[PDB]
Design brief:
2 copies of one chain form a homodimer. Chain A has about 70 residues and is an all-alpha fold. Chain A is about 70% helix and about 0% strand. Chain A has a single domain, classed as Up-down Bundle (Single alpha-helices involved in coiled-coils or other helix-helix interfaces). Chains A and B meet through helix 1, helix 2 and helix 4 of A and helix 1, helix 2 and helix 4 of B. The PDB classes it as chaperone.
């Protein structure tokens, strides 16, 4: 299964609001915004991946699994 | 801890060789390449994150944890 779509889009969602929240620095954000739109086009994902969105955003899972393995 | 750096860079590594392998389509790859360099600048990560790289690349963990939760 193409979990990589969900990977991209879930990151898109988190980075979207992270951008709004101003988590990164200005230039970082701006570049990050480009990254988002590139990731969308890269994995060929869309907001249709929101229809099949997972209960929690994957970045959250990453903060658990990737930080503790 | 900034696991988000490791997130970005580990994805950078996988996407780097995925780009080379031609996993995505041409335009997707090209856009994905831009995404990589943007993610690098976004999270403010570098190849120094390779020095602190995790045993396995995080995309692998994602194929486990994100696909099965």
């Amino acid at each position: 299964m193409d979990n990589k779509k969900r990977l991209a889009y879930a990151i898109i969602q988190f980075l979207h609001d992270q951008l709004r929240h101003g988590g990164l620095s200005s230039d970082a954000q701006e570049s990050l915004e480009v990254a988002i739109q590139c990731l969308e086009t890269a994995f060929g994902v869309t907001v249709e991946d929101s229809d099949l969105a997972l209960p929690q955003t994957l970045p959250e899972i990453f903060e658990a699994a990737a930080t503790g393995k």
